[PDB]
Design a protein around this ligand. Structure first.
Ligand SMILES: *[C@@H]1O[C@H](CO)[C@@H](O)[C@H](O)[C@H]1NC(C)=O
Ligand SMILES: *[C@@H]1O[C@H](CO)[C@@H](O)[C@H](O)[C@H]1NC(C)=O
Lengths: 437, 437
């Protein structure tokens, strides 16, 4: 039978359900979420690194003109100087004194170590969740990896599964992210061509081995004043290094919902946000006939000094009388109560002891011992341990959160006040009726 | 000087503009969009083609039983068959009389011709637009490939131009696009792992040469009733061929505003939608000092043979008695009328005949004949032909479509009705004044 069921998408915390057809015995569906990868659609938009800003040797022409042409090479600052006099070791460098032209040109290039120290800037638009489920039914165990997109099955040969649309869309990455050496940043980098000097992406290329490199690093060229030849340039500081100085915090540290971010590809593992509805097609071979199943006749339950916590600190004792031997599954239909064992053994009119975990101060729930119903209504104390090392397995509800005695005095007080108003109105009605006569 | 102007996005249709600055004189401006590529970002969801449904050699063996194992081949289908007894040419293929076993097997691989006859599935996310721009100012022509996404300089060597956001971003592509053989289609394909029998995406892969392929076409294998060895299988029709039968028309013939769509890369060039803000900073050398500009003592205007249309059919004649010589720019300050020319060689005293287009019957406009203003009135005749080969030049406003006679008669009727209302209230007021006495 196809059984739709809502499961929290937290890693760990095994979730339990009971499947049942009216002509068949109940079976213990066991569904556990192991992994949850949020791999979004990521496309590379540029790559940047610290520039090498290498300057070529200057050109000299002497008693003439040396006007330079435009170039198709990154950040080509070209300027000519008149009235110069280059002088290397040995003597002067041309033959005129005053009428001279020095062609000083400068460009930038990727540093030799940009193969590693490089930040790639991408856009992230839509994230889809892949979830691994371990499901055991009728002591048959299957692990399978599926999607949450709502229309995709997985290992359908053993068990047919659909994981529908998740209740909440997280998308921890924003629209526009930066990747550096395994660290993720939500940086609003400038687009391709918005070439601000001194900030991130001051030099960008399409790929790491590419000649399509653009840079607007502000290189101001100065006319030399010394007797020797050199090219004096003053350049804006590397915006890659300035961004690295005040990048902020990576998403291995600031990811909500406990996400752990991995690179190559970009993904967010072990995220616990919302709930997922999944429809499970239980195969008919796993169904066991109710005639073969040992039926139960009398059931009763009295818990003994439970606790409510993330730990499995409560225990039922179940009194019963049945007709035959065999193991049957036990499940609680209340959202407050989840048990420990998905099945137990019932032989003949004895006793059994089971464990559970709850969150309400009142332990009011229903137990399906070998099927049917068994209502347990009791009370137990809050825990003494302040902090626990495992997540809470039960979501709180306002109806269950308020304790039973608290409902008792609140209901009695509100009923008393309302009774005062009712008796006052009744006295008014009776008094008006008598004074009318 | 920053001169922000709004230019129609329509390709071709050169845009006149005027740059006036105090002391730096009027100057012509020529803004033309030559090409407008709209390149989005796409991610390859999967590839698909015709499958091959290869049936391997059968595994028959005798006086025994066979049990297959799961394989990683796409759409792996076992069936073990008892009681088989195969024949080839020569006789029985095995010893054992009746109790036998044969493992009938079938899986799915690519066709040999998937290298060309394949369809890729892409998720078009968001399209940014790029304009090749041709700007002519004074006697200087420049071409620059600018980005339209926001602040991005173009040809920064001589003329920094910033193209703002588009007025209304219209995407010809839907969120899902299938490309086959250079033809694009807006097909909502099933996602990865959402295979269906007899439908598109029945076989999916990351690439054509990839081995991690998967398919869910309904192959079922039947018991071989014939005496000879044979593997009978019935399989659902190829969803690729079924989609090819009824794919519908491609987007090269259904795209709004008429881009030409071409692939590698996926792009849609030269639609015509909306308006674009462009801020241009003209270099200071191009401005002429206002002293050398030959100004007019006084202008005049007249029209001849007006035909309001998409063509430059209207003709006007202007009289001048300028004080000096030389060429100087002329421009029309009309949102509903644009001139043909951009400059005129004014010479002392004489007459200039020029051409213009307009989309209003009452062609009244203000033009600047090489300075100041010139008011022109024309009662412009309707066009003769019904269909014109080249597009329009101005957009029609509500006040422009109404001719002078229409304003006269309509305003006369509303004025008459309002006059009756006013005189009625006046007569009521004075009648109340007389009866108050
Ligand atoms: C940049 O790095 C220097 C190096 O010492 C550091 O002092 C400074 O705080 C960093 N940040 C800024 C914003 O200057
Ligand atoms: C499919 O192909 C057949 C083959 O003749 C053709 O008649 C039919 O129009 C095509 N389309 C549909 C939607 O059946």
């Amino acid at each position: 039978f196809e059984h739709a069921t809502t499961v929290p998408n937290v890693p760990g915390i095994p979730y339990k359900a009971l499947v049942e057809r009216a002509g068949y015995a109940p079976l213990n569906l066991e569904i556990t979420v192991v992994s949850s990868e949020l791999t979004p659609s990521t496309n590379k938009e540029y790559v940047t690194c610290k520039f090498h800003t290498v300057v070529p040797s200057p050109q000299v022409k002497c008693c003439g003109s040396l006007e330079c042409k435009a170039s198709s090479k990154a950040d080509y600052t070209c300027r000519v100087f008149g009235g110069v006099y280059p002088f290397m070791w040995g003597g002067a460098q041309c033959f005129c004194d005053s009428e001279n032209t020095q062609l000083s040109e400068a460009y930038v290039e990727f540093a030799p170590d940009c193969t590693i120290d490089h930040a790639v800037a991408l856009k992230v638009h839509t994230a889809a969740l892949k979830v691994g489920l371990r499901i055991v039914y009728g002591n048959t165990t299957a692990r399978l990896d599926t999607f949450v997109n709502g229309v995709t099955p997985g290992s359908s040969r053993d068990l047919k599964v659909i994981a529908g649309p998740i209740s909440a869309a997280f998308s921890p990455f924003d629209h526009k992210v930066v990747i550096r050496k395994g660290l993720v940043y939500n940086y609003d980098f400038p687009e391709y061509g918005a070439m601000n000097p001194g900030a991130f992406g001051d030099i960008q290329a399409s790929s790491l081995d590419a000649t399509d490199i653009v840079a607007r690093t502000d290189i101001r060229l100065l006319k030399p004043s010394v007797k020797n030849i050199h090219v004096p340039y003053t350049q804006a500081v590397s915006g890659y290094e300035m961004w690295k100085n005040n990048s902020g915090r990576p998403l291995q540290e600031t990811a909500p919902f406990g996400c752990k971010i991995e690179v190559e590809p970009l993904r967010a593992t072990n995220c616990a946000y919302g709930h997922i509805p999944i429809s499970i097609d239980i195969p008919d071979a796993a169904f066991v006939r109710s005639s073969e199943s040992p039926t139960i006749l009398e059931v009763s339950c009295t818990v003994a000094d439970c606790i409510y916590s993330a730990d499995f600190g409560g225990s039922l004792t179940l009194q019963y009388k049945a007709n035959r031997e065999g193991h049957c599954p036990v499940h609680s239909h209340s959202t407050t109560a989840v048990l420990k064992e998905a099945t137990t053994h019932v032989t003949a009119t004895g006793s059994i002891t089971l464990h559970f975990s709850t969150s309400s101060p009142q332990a009011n729930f229903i137990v399906s011992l070998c099927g049917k119903k068994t209502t347990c209504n009791a009370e137990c104390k809050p825990p003494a341990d302040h902090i626990i090392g495992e997540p809470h397995k039960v979501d709180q509800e306002f109806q269950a959160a308020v304790s039973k005695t608290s409902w008792n005095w609140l209901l009695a007080l509100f009923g008393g006040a309302s009774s005062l108003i009712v008796v006052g109105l009744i006295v008014l009605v009776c008094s008006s009726m008598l004074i009318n006569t």
